[PDB]
Design a protein around this ligand. Structure first.
Ligand SMILES: CC(C)CCC[C@@H](C)[C@H]1CC[C@H]2[C@@H]3CC=C4C[C@@H](O)CC[C@]4(C)[C@H]3CC[C@]12C
Ligand SMILES: CC(C)CCC[C@@H](C)[C@H]1CC[C@H]2[C@@H]3CC=C4C[C@@H](O)CC[C@]4(C)[C@H]3CC[C@]12C
Ligand SMILES: CC(C)CCC[C@@H](C)[C@H]1CC[C@H]2[C@@H]3CC=C4C[C@@H](O)CC[C@]4(C)[C@H]3CC[C@]12C
Ligand SMILES: CCCCCCCC/C=C\CCCCCCCC(=O)OC[C@@H](O)CO
Ligand SMILES: CCCCCCCC/C=C\CCCCCCCC(=O)OC[C@H](O)CO
Ligand SMILES: CCCCCCCC/C=C\CCCCCCCC(=O)OC[C@H](O)CO
Ligand SMILES: CCCCCCCC/C=C\CCCCCCCC(=O)OC[C@H](O)CO
Ligand SMILES: CCCCCCCC/C=C\CCCCCCCC(=O)OC[C@H](O)CO
Ligand SMILES: CCCCCCCC/C=C\CCCCCCCC(=O)OC[C@H](O)CO
Ligand SMILES: CCCCCCCC/C=C\CCCCCCCC(=O)OC[C@H](O)CO
Ligand SMILES: Nc1nc(NCCc2ccc(O)cc2)nc2nc(-c3ccco3)nn12
Ligand SMILES: CCCCCCCC/C=C\CCCCCCCC(=O)O
Ligand SMILES: CCCCCCCC/C=C\CCCCCCCC(=O)O
Ligand SMILES: CCCCCCCC/C=C\CCCCCCCC(=O)O
Ligand SMILES: CCCCCCCC/C=C\CCCCCCCC(=O)O
Length: 388
């Protein structure tokens, strides 16, 4: 077969390219949040945590990946840290991605309580805890779950590594039962499924709330028709009592409108409980004015906020999807290596393609922000133009 350096050269050059783009793209995200106070919210502090992890892929994980591919002689625990530091960074990404999803879930479910519950200080403390935990989880092989105790003694002697040293190769130091059960199933796959669960809930909450505002608007128009074509005063009482409850339902520029509305219903209801039928109908037609000038304005704003939240949650879901798309092939190959001992090992070229693909994830997020979030796009422009 071909000399190692030729395939090695391609892989290294490709990794360096990805490293440059990961650094530049994510430095840009961080600089954007720094300058623009419209981007200075709790959601984006997790985005910055995610960008920092991706900067660290470029600055450290990729140079580590280049190093480990050589199979150089190294002390096994040093080799372990080289092998496992990337797992810290992906774990950090998982936590950041899960925190964004929960944040956007809290925001839709309880918006009036959101700012009181989800603060910068609380967010900052979560980020710190998650980074400590990512170091714990990612470097678990250094705590003793390693193949240092069982070194590949043929490889060690052939390239003359020192006493205590190993030929530094991922699959000779990192156990595959760790990679599959602990790293893939427990640490990646469960939180991804949880994220999917949280996002589907966000879309349900949005659909449910949009339906409520549709139904409250239609009740106001159905019951308005009932008053117009009514036989007696007690029928008008039925339509107004339903209408009054629906007015207080949508209640919880703005507050003056539902005051006029409930006021005018109370006027027509007071007349309907005296048997003044035509006066109650005339007063209930004056609700039309309030409905145009105030209520139609409230509905449109409430509807467009929810549509903005759907659109925002979709954008952030795409990021979770592209994380899964870039990382799954490497995990699936590990599952094949682990669960199928009768299968021949995935070839060297596919191994390195899967490593490269996993690393291109550290490039994609800045693009999704630029395309999908107007505030990031506009800040990107201002930085790029005013800079160089
Ligand atoms: C402060 C940041 C930016 C620098 C990070 C320092 C990095 C480059 C250092 C810290 C610990 C170091 C490792 C510690 C131990 C060994 C074992 C030895 O047999 C070969 C080198 C090797 C594998 C080192 C490689 C470089 C290493 C990973
Ligand atoms: C999330 C989507 C995009 C990932 C698709 C799964 C990919 C990674 C799957 C589909 C077919 C799979 C291959 C099927 C057959 C073999 C032969 C076996 O002897 C070793 C593993 C190997 C080489 C598999 C590696 C992973 C593989 C290439
Ligand atoms: C829920 C989805 C998105 C996550 C992907 C599921 C993963 C865990 C599944 C999908 C395909 C599965 C593989 C399909 C085929 C084989 C070959 C068999 O000889 C041993 C198990 C093994 C290697 C499976 C292990 C688990 C596997 C990799
Ligand atoms: C090299 C490894 C990691 C690089 C660290 C990158 C850290 C960059 C953080 C940028 C930042 O603080 O901006 C966000 C705030 O302004 C929000 O208020
Ligand atoms: C060694 C470097 C490891 C990389 C760890 C880099 C630490 C990331 C912490 C960070 O930058 O996130 C803070 C966030 O911006 C708060 O608002
Ligand atoms: C940041 C740079 C990554 C650090 C890369 C770590 C370099 C390892 C070099 C090494 O230890 O190689 C010795 C080997 O025995 C050959 O003489
Ligand atoms: C100020 C200190 C910055 C923190 C930097 C601490 C450097 C951590 C890297 C390290 O020393 O790792 C040892 C290695 O794992 C041994 O095999
Ligand atoms: C969370 C904190 C974890 C603290 C646990 C840190 C324990 C130190 C692990 C360590 O040093 O690795 C084992 C030993 O050095 C191999 O010979
Ligand atoms: C998500 C949870 C994945 C957990 C799924 C648990 C399936 C593990 C079962 C398993 O690995 O089967 C044992 C077999 O003997 C291995 O060689
Ligand atoms: C989502 C859960 C993924 C569940 C994936 C679990 C599939 C593992 C398949 C397995 O355990 O393979 C057994 C085989 O006999 C070993 O030699
Ligand atoms: N299995 C695996 N191998 C490697 N590198 C070694 C590639 C290799 C594998 C087998 C072989 O005979 C020669 C070379 N890096 C790897 N990174 C990961 C990984 C990281 C996160 C999830 O999987 N898995 N993984
Ligand atoms: C979206 C993925 C980015 C495009 C990647 C371009 C393809 C080049 C990367 C890997 C090709 C395989 C290189 C040969 C195996 C490496 C040999 C070795 O390291 O010994
Ligand atoms: C911006 C801060 C500067 C940090 C850059 C540190 C420079 C070290 C990076 C790569 C050097 C790796 C050299 C590999 C050693 C070869 C072993 C040998 O000579 O046999
Ligand atoms: C923003 C700048 C920071 C980036 C600095 C990182 C530069 C590292 C570049 C290549 C890593 C060198 C890998 C050494 C291979 C070891 C070969 C061997 O000794 O067998
Ligand atoms: C990102 C670009 C991806 C397009 C090209 C990727 C192709 C990889 C998909 C399947 C590769 C199949 C490898 C053949 C397995 C060899 C069988 C064996 O183990 O001997």
């Amino acid at each position: 077969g071909a000399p190692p350096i030729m395939g090695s050269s391609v892989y290294i050059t490709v990794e360096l390219a990805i490293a440059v783009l990961a650094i530049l793209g994510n430095v840009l995200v961080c600089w954007a949040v720094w300058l623009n106070s419209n981007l200075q919210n709790v959601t984006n502090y997790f985005v910055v945590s995610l960008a920092a992890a991706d900067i660290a892929v470029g600055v450290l994980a990729i140079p580590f990946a280049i190093t480990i591919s050589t199979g150089f002689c190294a002390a096994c625990h040093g080799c372990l840290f080289i092998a496992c530091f990337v797992l810290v960074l992906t774990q950090s990404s998982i936590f950041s991605l899960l925190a964004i999803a929960i944040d956007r879930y809290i925001a839709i479910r309880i918006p009036l309580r959101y700012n009181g519950l989800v603060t910068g200080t609380r967010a900052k403390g979560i980020i710190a805890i998650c980074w400590v935990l990512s170091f714990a989880i990612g470097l678990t092989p250094m705590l003793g779950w390693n193949n240092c105790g069982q070194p590949k003694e043929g490889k060690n002697h052939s390239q003359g590594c020192g006493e205590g040293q190993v030929a530094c190769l991922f699959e000779d130091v990192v156990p595959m039962n760790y990679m599959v059960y602990f790293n893939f199933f427990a640490c990646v796959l469960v939180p991804l499924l949880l994220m999917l669960g949280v996002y589907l809930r966000i879309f349900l909450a949005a659909r449910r709330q949009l339906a409520d505002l549709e139904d409250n608007w239609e009740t106001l128009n159905d019951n308005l028709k009932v008053i117009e074509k009514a036989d007696n005063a007690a029928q008008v009482k039925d339509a107004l009592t339903k209408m009054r409850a629906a007015a207080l339902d949508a209640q919880k520029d703005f507050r003056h409108g539902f005051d006029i509305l409930v006021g005018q219903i109370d006027d027509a209801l007071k007349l309907a409980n005296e048997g003044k039928v035509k006066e109650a109908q005339a007063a209930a037609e004056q609700l039309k004015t309030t409905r145009n000038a105030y209520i139609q304005k409230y509905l449109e704003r409430a509807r467009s906020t929810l549509q903005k939240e759907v659109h925002a949650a979709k954008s952030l879901a795409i990021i979770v999807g592209l994380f899964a798309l870039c990382w799954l092939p490497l995990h699936i190959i590990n599952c094949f290596t682990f669960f199928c001992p009768d299968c021949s090992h995935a070839p060297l070229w596919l191994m390195y393609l899967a490593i490269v693909l996993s690393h291109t994830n550290s490039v994609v997020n800045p693009f999704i922000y630029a395309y999908r979030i107007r505030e990031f796009r506009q800040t990107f422009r201002k930085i790029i133009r005013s800079h160089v």
